[PDB]
């Protein structure tokens, strides 16, 4: 058999500077023909992989001519001559010259401009309500870098239980990132208390962003 | 040109499971059928490949038991069955015929009770831009699917990934429009839960009526 090893990690890459990713080969993908059989692909979150090259020098159709590959015939890298916000994704280096066997994958990540999160206070909905349940919902969204802290108050007093955080992958356009906070409570509960606030606190200022209601309003 | 694979199947443990991969304007006659594991943030790993001329199969060793890949040319579909399933057969199983790559089926290892999602519109509170939301709470197994204006309203929006907690997932997703476009042109969450064969579209409906 043939393993393809990659690293997962890589250092994030800063807009539009170069990028280079590594493969090996536990065998030579080097056929007597002269042909290097080493593919790559790109896969983007809840896609199939897509090709980007394949036998090491040809790019697929379509694909931007900024992808390019070379290597020893054990070694290679896929080198990406300046990082644009839609090359995000996890590469795969692959070959199939015994069978077809894929690396474990490296994913790509943009440095860009920090930026602060805006954000969103949402009341449950009066269906949620109606079926005896109370979850409301911050968005954090649009920041960068992905480090975020979310506060939750009911009161003026500090909730840590029934919350629930949910980051998205990089955007493909601006290259942020975007989290959801969830606070579940059941509607008794709910309508025990008035004031609901969600603080956000980012490197981008040493106040939290805050954003607040109150159930009587 | 497509590869249709249901998108979720959802198998008991130690039971077996028969994932179809059918083509749509493509037909399985000549190119090799290809089948393809990826578990959750891992990599891809090629399970085997069936020649649908004479039925020949080639499977990785560690899949050789595990795995019986089938076609059938008069359905146009091929068939990947895996036996005795466990944990670690929960992946994302793509089937792959002549460079095209079929959506997936997530695959399920659960005794756990297939549910509905609730869904849940998110209005603002009682700027320039405005932002809009949809909660998709309770449901099970994995995955949902969701759009904004049947897929036209693809600009300014984030869905969070889903969230396990006691048997049931949660998903959330955003919109942000310019603050002149709603209420004024409507703005529905599409969800669809392929296991429950629930589609629901969900209108985002101001808090308090426009006349107040």
């Known amino acids: 058999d043939i393993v393809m090893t990659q690293s997962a990690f890589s250092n994030p890459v800063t807009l539009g500077t170069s990028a280079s990713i590594s493969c090996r080969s536990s065998k030579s993908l080097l056929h007597r023909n002269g042909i290097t059989y080493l593919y790559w692909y790109l896969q983007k979150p809840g896609q199939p992989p897509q090709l980007l090259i394949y036998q090491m020098s040809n790019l697929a159709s379509g694909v931007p001519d900024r992808f390019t590959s070379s290597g020893s015939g054990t070694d290679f890298t896929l080198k990406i001559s300046r990082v644009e916000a839609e090359d995000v994704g996890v590469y795969y280096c692959?070959?199939?010259?015994?069978?077809?066997?894929f690396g474990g994958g490296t994913k790509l990540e943009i440095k860009r401009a920090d930026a602060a999160p805006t954000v969103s206070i949402f009341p449950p909905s009066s269906e949620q309500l109606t079926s005896g349940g109370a979850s409301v919902v911050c968005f954090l969204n649009n920041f960068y870098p992905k480090d975020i802290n979310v506060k939750w108050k009911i009161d003026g007093s500090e909730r840590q239980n029934g919350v629930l955080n949910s980051w998205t992958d990089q955007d493909s356009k601006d290259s942020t990132y975007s989290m959801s906070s969830t606070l579940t409570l059941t509607k008794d509960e709910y309508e025990r208390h008035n004031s609901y606030t969600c603080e956000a606190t980012h490197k981008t200022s040493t106040s939290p962003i805050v954003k607040s209601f109150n159930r009587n309003e | 040109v497509q590869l249709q694979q249901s998108g979720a199947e959802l198998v008991e443990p130690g039971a077996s499971v028969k994932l179809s991969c059918t083509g749509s304007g493509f037909n399985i006659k000549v190119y090799y059928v290809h089948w393809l594991k990826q578990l959750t943030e891992q990599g891809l790993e090629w399970i085997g490949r069936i020649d649908p001329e004479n039925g020949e199969t080639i499977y990785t060793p560690k899949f050789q038991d595990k795995a019986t890949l089938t076609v059938d040319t008069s359905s146009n579909t091929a068939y990947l069955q895996l036996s005795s399933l466990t944990s670690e057969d929960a992946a994302v199983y793509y089937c792959?015929?002549?460079?095209?790559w079929g959506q997936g089926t997530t695959l399920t290892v659960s005794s756990a009770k297939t549910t509905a999602p609730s869904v849940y519109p998110l209005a603002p509170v009682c700027g320039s831009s405005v932002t809009l939301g949809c909660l998709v709470k309770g449901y099970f197994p994995e995955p949902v699917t969701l759009t904004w204006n049947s897929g036209s309203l693809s600009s300014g929006v984030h869905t969070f990934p889903a969230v396990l907690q006691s048997d049931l997932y949660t998903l959330s997703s955003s919109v942000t429009v310019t603050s002149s476009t709603w209420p004024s042109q409507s703005i529905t969450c599409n969800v669809a839960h392929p296991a429950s064969s629930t589609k629901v579209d969900k209108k985002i409906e101001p808090r308090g009526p426009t006349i107040k």
């Open positions: 792959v015929s002549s460079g095209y």
């Open positions: 692959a070959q199939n010259l015994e069978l077809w066997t």
